[PDB]
Amino acid sequence: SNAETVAAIKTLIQQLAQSTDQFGRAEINDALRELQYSLETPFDTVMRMSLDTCQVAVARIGSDLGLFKHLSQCASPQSAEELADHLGCGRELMSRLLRYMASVRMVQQTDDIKYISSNITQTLAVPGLEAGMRHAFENLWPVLMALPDFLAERKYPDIVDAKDTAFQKAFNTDQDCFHWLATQPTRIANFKVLLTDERTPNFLSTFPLEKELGSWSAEPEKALFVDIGGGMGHACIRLREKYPNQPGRVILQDLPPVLQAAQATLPLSGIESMPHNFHTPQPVQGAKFYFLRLILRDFPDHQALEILQNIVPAMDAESRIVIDDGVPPEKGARWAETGTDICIMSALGSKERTQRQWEELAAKAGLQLQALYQYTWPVVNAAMVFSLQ
Amino acid sequence: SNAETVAAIKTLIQQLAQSTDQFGRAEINDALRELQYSLETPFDTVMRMSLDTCQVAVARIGSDLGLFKHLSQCASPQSAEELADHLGCGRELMSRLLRYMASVRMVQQTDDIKYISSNITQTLAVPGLEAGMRHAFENLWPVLMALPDFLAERKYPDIVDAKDTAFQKAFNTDQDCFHWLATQPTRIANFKVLLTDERTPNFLSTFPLEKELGSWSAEPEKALFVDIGGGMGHACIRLREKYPNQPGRVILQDLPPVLQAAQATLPLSGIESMPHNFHTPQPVQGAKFYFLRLILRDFPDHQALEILQNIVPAMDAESRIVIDDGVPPEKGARWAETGTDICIMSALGSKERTQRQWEELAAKAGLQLQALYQYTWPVVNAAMVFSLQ
Amino acid sequence: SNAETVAAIKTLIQQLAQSTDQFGRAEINDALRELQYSLETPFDTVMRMSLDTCQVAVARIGSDLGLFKHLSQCASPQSAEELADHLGCGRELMSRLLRYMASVRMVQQTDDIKYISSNITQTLAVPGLEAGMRHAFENLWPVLMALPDFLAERKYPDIVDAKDTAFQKAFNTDQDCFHWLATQPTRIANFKVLLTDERTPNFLSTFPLEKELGSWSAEPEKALFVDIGGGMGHACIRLREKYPNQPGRVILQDLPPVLQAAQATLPLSGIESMPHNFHTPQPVQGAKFYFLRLILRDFPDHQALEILQNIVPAMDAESRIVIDDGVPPEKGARWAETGTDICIMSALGSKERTQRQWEELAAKAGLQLQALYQYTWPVVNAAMVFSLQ
Amino acid sequence: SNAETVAAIKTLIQQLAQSTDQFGRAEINDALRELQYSLETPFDTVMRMSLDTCQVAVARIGSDLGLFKHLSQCASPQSAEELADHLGCGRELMSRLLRYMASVRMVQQTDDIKYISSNITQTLAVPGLEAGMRHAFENLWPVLMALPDFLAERKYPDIVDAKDTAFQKAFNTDQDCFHWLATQPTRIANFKVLLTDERTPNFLSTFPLEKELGSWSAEPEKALFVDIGGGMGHACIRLREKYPNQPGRVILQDLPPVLQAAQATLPLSGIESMPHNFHTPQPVQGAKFYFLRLILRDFPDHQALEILQNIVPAMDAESRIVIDDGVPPEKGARWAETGTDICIMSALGSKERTQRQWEELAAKAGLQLQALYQYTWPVVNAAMVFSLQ
Numbered sequence A, B, C, D: 001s002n003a004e005t006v007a008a009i010k011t012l013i014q015q016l017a018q019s020t021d022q023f024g025r026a027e028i029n030d031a032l033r034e035l036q037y038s039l040e041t042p043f044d045t046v047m048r049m050s051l052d053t054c055q056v057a058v059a060r061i062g063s064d065l066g067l068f069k070h071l072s073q074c075a076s077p078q079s080a081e082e083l084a085d086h087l088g089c090g091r092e093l094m095s096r097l098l099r100y101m102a103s104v105r106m107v108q109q110t111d112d113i114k115y116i117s118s119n120i121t122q123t124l125a126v127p128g129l130e131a132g133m134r135h136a137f138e139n140l141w142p143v144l145m146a147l148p149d150f151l152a153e154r155k156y157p158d159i160v161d162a163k164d165t166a167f168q169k170a171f172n173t174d175q176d177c178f179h180w181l182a183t184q185p186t187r188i189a190n191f192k193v194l195l196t197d198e199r200t201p202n203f204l205s206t207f208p209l210e211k212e213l214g215s216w217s218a219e220p221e222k223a224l225f226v227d228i229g230g231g232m233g234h235a236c237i238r239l240r241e242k243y244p245n246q247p248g249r250v251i252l253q254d255l256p257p258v259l260q261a262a263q264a265t266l267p268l269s270g271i272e273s274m275p276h277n278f279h280t281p282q283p284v285q286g287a288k289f290y291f292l293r294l295i296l297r298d299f300p301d302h303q304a305l306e307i308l309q310n311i312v313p314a315m316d317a318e319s320r321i322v323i324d325d326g327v328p329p330e331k332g333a334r335w336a337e338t339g340t341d342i343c344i345m346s347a348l349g350s351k352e353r354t355q356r357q358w359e360e361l362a363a364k365a366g367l368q369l370q371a372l373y374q375y376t377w378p379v380v381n382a383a384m385v386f387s388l389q
Ligand SMILES: C[S@@+](CC[C@H](N)C(=O)[O-])C[C@H]1O[C@@H](n2cnc3c(N)ncnc32)[C@H](O)[C@@H]1O
Pocket: A195, A228, A229, A230, A231, A232, A233, A234, A235, A253, A254, A255, A258, A276, A277, A278, A279, A292, A293, A294, A295
């Protein structure tokens, strides 16, 4: 029986998944995708590409309605009628949306055709993750929609400039993306929520702090850690939590509105909040670690180089710049890192960088790679430690 | 070891897939998708929704470049540089596109970092399947991009009318989709190619023609099969191929430009090409089978009913209307049929119909269901045989 | 490809086995056996039954030669010639024995046609486990060889009596097995070694000792645990190890030659060694637990009842008799417990007992079951706690 | 859940087994055995070796009772009581035997504790396969039981002589096995039934007869095929069935009592029955094929050589001796061929032979190997074609 075979595959892959760690589960998931793509018929390939688009549109509708938050806190299954009436949605529309969501596990449909939350329901109810989905819909979709004709009309240029990529066509503007976004209050508000998401694991799981410090002295009033564009300060928080007795100032640098949003959740002491624009010279002199997490991927080389050149003059011989970012391999890169590469090309003019590309960029700033500490697999994020050449 | 476990999973799934038929492979593939969604982390869920969008955009670029057709006819692996120079693409852009494509199996990357075709490459090189992907990009994505704000602005109405859905917002028109498309030659050209795709399997794999025929006589000069909106006439061609000895007229009905396109590949004899607008009364009297394949799903009830009411007066007691279309279940419907439902709601105002919904529609035309012959699984397509009530 | 499928099956089963515990691995192993028997051809079934016999005979030869102990301490693969010369075996005989052993994993053969130890090699090198294999060869096989003609000659009687079973035919004696064995020094010597094997896990893994103890007082000088026929005293040793702070006498009871063998490995204090024949009245009065592990399975009902009736008069109201033995289910019993049943029927006239059969036996002694604490699965061993009725 | 995992393993291995051929299923079965042996605990290893012995003893009892034949023709499940009364067995004995048989799939136990035939029940009801099991019990078991002490008392000699192996100790005789068996009427009767079993597949599935014949002419009255020790003549029958129009005499040679038993099932014409002792000179001169299937494995080299030397003088340059027998590999031999090797060593003084060992034996008769045609895997049986040197 087909049904018996399918259920047996599910049982065995679930047991295997439970028996490994998060990195092993990520490897299994990538293999399931690869299997799916190799076993689909030609028609199925086009149907998948045609319809998987629906998920973000329907998640955006569920978010607008508050459906995922509401379902995540219901204690019993809800009918489509009950959901429609509670959330202010046409009843037939709600029923069709729910049937679609259940078919892609965005909710669960029960045997009596009522609806309960799934793992994905709970995910889309989390503010920061919801904001990620909303960002995909309102910022990524339009640049991807513009990219093919942008490239066709321009005879397939290498994209190298944040002011000359698909974003300008998609939003009918000559501004670059970051400048334009700063003029759009609802879009800024969504980024504020997005910053509350904290990725796990983080670089402290493999960063050999005591080894990298050696005999470094914090006196007088030297900074241990300067978190440049640190957002809510998650890296500073985790550093203080893991090494509470390590001397040295721990400093969160960001723009004033982000620092203001960070205050409610920062510790009352031990982490300084310092307004600082990272396109301007670094004020903190001689720090041990100048930390850039998921900053430089958003900039083409010219701008990324300028960000580094604003830090290098503040370094002493013991200082290090730590770039915590994606490091895709030379070959066999996975969809999460190549897809990111295409999206940030189209919106930002930037790119994912291999280790050798990071080293070439840093050498232009007078920096040499001393160590690289991977902390996620198989898609690699790593803390790259650079010193003055 | 975890690599070894992943390779063993692939080996076993590949072997189970080869030991079943196409319907069993479709069930396995849906299971792999369900497993993937249940094993992903919350972050991975949002990453997948954010990035799976990239595939249609990049497939559209490769189609514009002629990459898939070129790679499918190459006899040896090609470097990114070779492909970029041949196709007229910036070398860095080409390399980045190819790395993304290899990561989603749109091409395959070799250990030498060169590129060969995959199953998906070959699929996207086929004109009719390529046209389906291009249709998703240029027609479906704009209406899905418009749907959430359309619904929000209108306070979530049940969509019931082809003239009042997301299409009018997406394309800034008051026309319905079909009327607007007829004014857009480049889109018309893509639909012309899309009509050359023939779906497999088809209803003749399970339709018990001799049983449904009974003792119907083709004498003196009666019509066996009238293919209403038959496109290229594939159903007529397959009918004559499978039943070469059954007498009676076999008639392809469509609009003149489509009949003209059909002529080159119709048999030289045995199939008549009759121009006929199915919004007007059916001219062929007393045919055994009036066949509507994938026609009525494109219309809301009011218009679908009109199409049926145009046929009913031509029927005699032995005539049957055969609706060949999707028949999703009452519960547990799959993503291909619910995703289709959301898309045709958004572009056409129409809907997928369960068996009970098909029967209710047909009853309004004075028709009763006699038999239903499924021919695909697990997503249901079936030939529904209706007679006069 | 079929090689690849077989390797993938091994990889997946090995991984599932490592992800569970010993009871789950035992369930997997029984499943593999059931699969083997259902997939074999009729010829293969007869070949398996004909040849699996070879394993005990060849293990007995390797034990005689000292092969398993020698190979288990070798640091490099050994050739057949090296092993034959070292152990004093004909070179061709040795090579043929080793090829047979490697084919059933009793040793492993390398790609260079040399030999190293396997898990089974190490097992057969352990004195107590080796002695179990030697017991099967010299005591069990003769009684199984005699059983079919014993039954045929006697017209298939229910075997009820230790003095009238297959043992008397096998060994040409009118003595019962236990009485005969006491006259056979080489067999006695093997049993002495077999007693040093300690089974794992044991009842203390699940026995809720503090709950069963309640408020029992060891004062003034009462007995906590009387191990009746305790052999080397493993239960006493493990009890004192797990419950080092529970007061009360812990007493090992057995016959003098066995107590003398136990002395070298008993703790220096805390466990008394008391000679006692369990066919005579229990001398220790009012103990909390009188413990019988794998004793009563060796006796038919009449004699097993006598052993219990010898203990009952020593019991006070808080005393309990704890039978630790096999408890096969009413249906679906596994080969280890039914194979044991046939063997002890044939040698000893006794039987495995279900829970209901244990309760019926104990009721004849005036005892009632209070609790049953399973500690192995799927083959059931359990500590059954009985009190005065 | 363990039960869910185990059921899923069973489902997947059954589906994989169905999807391959008989040789692939044999490979899966050997892998399941290997998995079982590597995953068992040390105690489980000794319990398996101790108890798997029970299967042949209990099958012999079921055979004596007629249980397997009776159950194989019952149309409903039978209780132990019904079986006991019908077959003349003590009721408790029958119930215990059935529980044991069900635990090793020799019968099936139902949920209401009644009994139905399994695949193995049906196998043990087939006369020739039943006779194989009975042969294992009455002829193989005693020589295996005698082998360890035979080898110990003789200081581990290479066994090379049919008159000096374990058989003489086991049966207290100076005769060799074949001579002694010919004096034992019940044992002869069992061999008569055993000869009715026909192994599948056979050498004609891969033997390129037309290629090996070339331009061979059958005139005058030449023999195509002389089946030396051909038993019931299955090889002659299959040859005539597959090549009905091939000229040349087809001759079955065996001893008179076997030829007599063969007459009832031989074709009425086209196969000659010729009494002939293969320890005497071959009477048929110049035959194309002198065929020896499973003959020479039963003889030490000296006797096997004599059998060949009785044929070689009858050969002309076109004649071939075809040895159809086991050809174990140089390394990695499987249990069915090494177990056979140990059994025939112990009973017959003979041995399994690798290809190189067959060639060394045949060269002593003045023969050279021209071709070898395998027809079973992974345990190899092959038709080896030899010509005069
Ligand atoms: C991708 S978020 C990275 C946050 C943080 N590094 C982390 O991983 O937890 C980019 C951050 O850069 C900050 N940012 C953007 N432009 C900046 C600028 N010109 N100067 C300082 N911070 C800036 C944003 O406010 C935001 O917090």
